[PDB]
């Protein structure tokens, strides 16, 4: 376990041979070094003798406790599960480093003395807000954008994969990335390919669900959220639809906008706090970019501002080609009549038409998709 971190010749050399031969002699020295201790000091088994001596110290009714202070000379005040706290002492098999206020520990039944500490059963919300797997396909699924994708790899992926380029430059990566445009323009869709691509611990949160009914529960949820993001790894925090904190008012919130405000203040701390931040990236996305506070949008808090335009028609045919790739297209159709049907159709619109047309074929048990499928299909999708 972490015996020798050096690998640097990386060849067939007498260097890499003599490494092990040295460490060979040291590990044999450890073997026959400890071998004499039981040869001339049997006196025990030492594999379970001292171990069950510890387990003969500690009783089987192991009560579960929680720290609240520390006095260094192995005694402290520890809170009971009832609440009536004590002033017990602490053992020598307690390996006194994992002791923080509020931690779960192991106590005696009788004198309630601090026997051991307890590993904490994670947290329900960490898994809830924690994204497990890659959602879907890569960046090749998107099509048409091809410029800001270089922007997203630029601020996000390239800092991860090539931390040589910033160092030869004498520079750090940009901090904050924001995404804005018309709705249905693939804003979340790009983040799915990011969540495909990355190996970092990924988090995703809607801007709508920040708001609470309890006072300060929002900002508390923020503080523990950034706690979770920082405590894990090179992490990617995504926020969708952050305008919804400013647009809609809900009567579940006891406070009005002057609690929403305080929520945005605590978040505004967590972007640009004086504390050492660490390796957490921030991707934001919405459609109403003009509405929120520009104080969150200052450089220092967000560096990169990324608009998503409406698709041009030669990109539209590409998006049709993507959403018609694996499907049994009957050759009755022409996609170019389908392009100019709406002047300002989204990429959600194309897939809506395609999938709904597949629903129309599955009404008639068919396998291929004909022209009138699209004819009545856009009647269903667009006009209502």
């Amino acid at each position: 376990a972490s015996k020798l971190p050096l690998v640097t010749p990386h060849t067939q050399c007498r260097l890499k041979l003599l490494k092990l031969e040295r460490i060979k002699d040291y590990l044999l020295m450890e073997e026959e070094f400890i071998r004499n201790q039981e040869q001339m000091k049997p006196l025990e088994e030492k594999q379970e003798e001292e171990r069950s001596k510890v387990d003969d110290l500690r009783g089987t009714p192991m009560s579960v406790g929680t720290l609240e202070e520390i006095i260094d000379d192995n005694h402290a005040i520890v809170s009971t599960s009832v609440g009536s706290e004590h002033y017990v002492s602490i053992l020598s098999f307690v390996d006194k480093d994992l002791l923080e206020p509020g931690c779960s520990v192991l106590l005696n039944h009788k004198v309630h003395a601090v026997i051991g500490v307890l590993m904490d059963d994670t947290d329900p919300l960490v898994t809830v807000m924690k994204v497990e797997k890659a959602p879907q396909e890569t960046y090749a699924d998107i099509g048409g954008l091809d410029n800001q994708i270089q922007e997203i790899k630029e601020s996000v992926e390239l800092p991860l994969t090539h931390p040589e380029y910033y160092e030869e430059m004498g520079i750090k990566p940009p901090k904050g990335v924001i995404l804005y445009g018309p709705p249905g323009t693939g804003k979340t869709l790009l983040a799915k390919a990011v969540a495909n691509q990355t190996s970092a611990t990924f988090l995703r949160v809607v801007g709508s669900e920040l708001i609470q009914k309890y006072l300060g529960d929002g900002p508390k949820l923020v503080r523990e959220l950034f706690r979770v993001a920082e405590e894990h790894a090179p992490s990617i925090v995504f926020i969708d639809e952050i305008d919804a904190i400013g647009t809609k008012r809900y009567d579940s919130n006891s406070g009005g906008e002057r609690e929403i405000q305080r929520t945005m203040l605590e978040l505004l701390n967590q972007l640009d706090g004086f504390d050492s931040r660490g390796d957490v990236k921030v991707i934001m996305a919405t459609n109403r970019i003009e509405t929120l506070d520009p104080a969150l949008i200052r450089p220092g808090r967000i560096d990169r501002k990324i608009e998503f335009p409406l698709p041009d028609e030669k990109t539209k045919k590409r998006i049709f080609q993507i959403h018609t790739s694996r499907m049994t297209l009957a050759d009755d159709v022409t996609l170019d009549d389908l392009i100019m049907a709406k002047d300002d159709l989204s990429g959600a619109d194309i897939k809506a038409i395609c999938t709904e047309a597949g629903l129309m074929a599955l009404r008639e048990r068919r396998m291929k998709v004909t022209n009138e499928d699209f004819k009545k299909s856009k009647e269903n999708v667009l006009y209502k």
Partner: protein, 394 residues
């Protein structure tokens, strides 16, 4: 040449490490304990010595005493209350009232006094650790650096020049301007340079769900503040913690105002904080309450505006000192291109201007690379720019 001969002679000793280190005893990965090779102090003696003579000594809280006699009045967590006594090992001196004491479970007598409650969420906002921000790095507002630093550290580092002159130094100071101007970044150089308890406070963390709840947190903060001799209390973004009182009709924003009034009381009146210096910083000061803005609480009043030309050039020389560039560029040209601009924007231009050299295959940025930063950051992001309604602070 000896391809397998290095690999298996490598591998049998990489395994033979573990094959006898299991015969040492590090194994049986636990559920919360310690290394078996370490605990052996409490092995035969303290196992029956720190245990079998040792009591539990349940901790309590004193109500009060009475005259002529000990006849102490104890209090516990949930249960009833007793008339109790000392031990012989302690004097009745430090058995003052309202004090936590360790007390046996049988005779119910006092063993040792205890420190009172600290409420560890307040303990968390002690920083314990310093950032690296140099006064060299906040260059451009050196008069503000001086005018602040003469207030902050000079009595702490020299408590004689104020005394022998015969003046009491001020205690309170706010810092304010538009965002990104170097308020928080400026505070980090103080937390760098300092030595005493630097207890930071962000006001939205005081937003509680119960009533009076943050108000007691204020009190406890000043309790452990008065324990220390000299202590620096930091206040970030105090507009959440209070604008003013404006109440009309149904009581709106009632709860915040009472905590603000407690903050007033802990600052001024009736044998105060003494040697406890405070430091606020806001974005928009215009919202703030006048009695809060009364001196004796917020004496020094430091503005942070944009640098004139030379501070901006200096900020170019701060963020731009450590990047591969063309040697023969000039920054004064760029500062001419950035009239109304913060140093965060300057840094952002530095970091983007590197990325231009990172775009194709260049190692060092050029002047026209900087120009490629200027129009994009300054003029293409000019829809947002966040500043001008904060110049008026609305």
């Amino acid at each position: 040449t000896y391809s397998r001969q290095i690999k298996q002679v490598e591998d049998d000793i990489q395994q033979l490490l573990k094959k006898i280190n299991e015969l040492t005893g590090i194994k049986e990965s636990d559920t919360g304990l310690a290394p078996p090779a370490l605990w052996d102090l409490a092995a035969d003696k303290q196992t029956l010595q720190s245990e079998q003579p040792l009591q539990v000594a349940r901790c309590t809280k004193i109500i009060n005493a009475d005259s002529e006699d000990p006849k102490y009045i104890i209090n516990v967590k949930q249960f009833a209350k007793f008339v109790v006594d000392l031990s012989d090992q302690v004097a009745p001196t430090d058995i003052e009232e309202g004090m936590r004491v360790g007390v046996d479970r049988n005779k119910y007598q006092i063993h040792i006094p205890l420190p009172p409650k600290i409420d560890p969420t307040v303990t968390m906002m002690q920083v314990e650790e310093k950032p690296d921000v140099t006064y060299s790095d906040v260059g451009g507002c050196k008069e503000q650096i001086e005018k602040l630093r003469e207030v902050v550290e000079t009595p702490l580092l020299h408590p004689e020049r104020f005394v022998n002159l015969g003046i009491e130094p001020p205690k309170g100071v706010l810092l304010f301007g538009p965002p990104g101007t170097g308020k928080t970044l400026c505070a980090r150089a103080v937390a760098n340079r300092t030595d005493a308890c630097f207890i930071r406070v962000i006001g939205s963390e005081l937003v509680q769900k119960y009533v009076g709840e943050g108000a007691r947190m204020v009190r406890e903060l000043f309790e452990m503040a008065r324990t220390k001799k000299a202590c620096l209390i930091f206040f970030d973004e105090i507009d959440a913690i209070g604008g003013a009182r404006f109440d009309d009709g149904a009581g709106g924003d009632n709860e915040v105002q009472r905590t603000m009034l407690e903050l007033i009381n802990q600052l001024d009146g009736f044998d105060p904080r003494g040697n406890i210096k405070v430091l606020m910083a806001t974005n928009r000061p215009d919202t703030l309450d006048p009695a809060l803005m009364r001196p004796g609480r917020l004496d020094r009043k430091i503005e942070f505006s944009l640098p004139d030309l030379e501070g901006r050039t200096h900020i170019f020389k701060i963020h731009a000192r450590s990047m591969s560039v063309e040697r023969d560029i000039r920054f004064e040209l760029l500062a001419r291109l950035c009239p109304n601009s913060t140093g965060a924007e300057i840094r952002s231009v530095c970091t983007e201007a590197g990325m231009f050299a990172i775009r194709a295959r260049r190692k060092i940025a050029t002047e026209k690379d900087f120009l490629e930063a200027v129009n994009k950051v300054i003029k293409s992001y000019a829809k947002f720019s966040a500043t001008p309604r904060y110049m008026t602070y609305n």
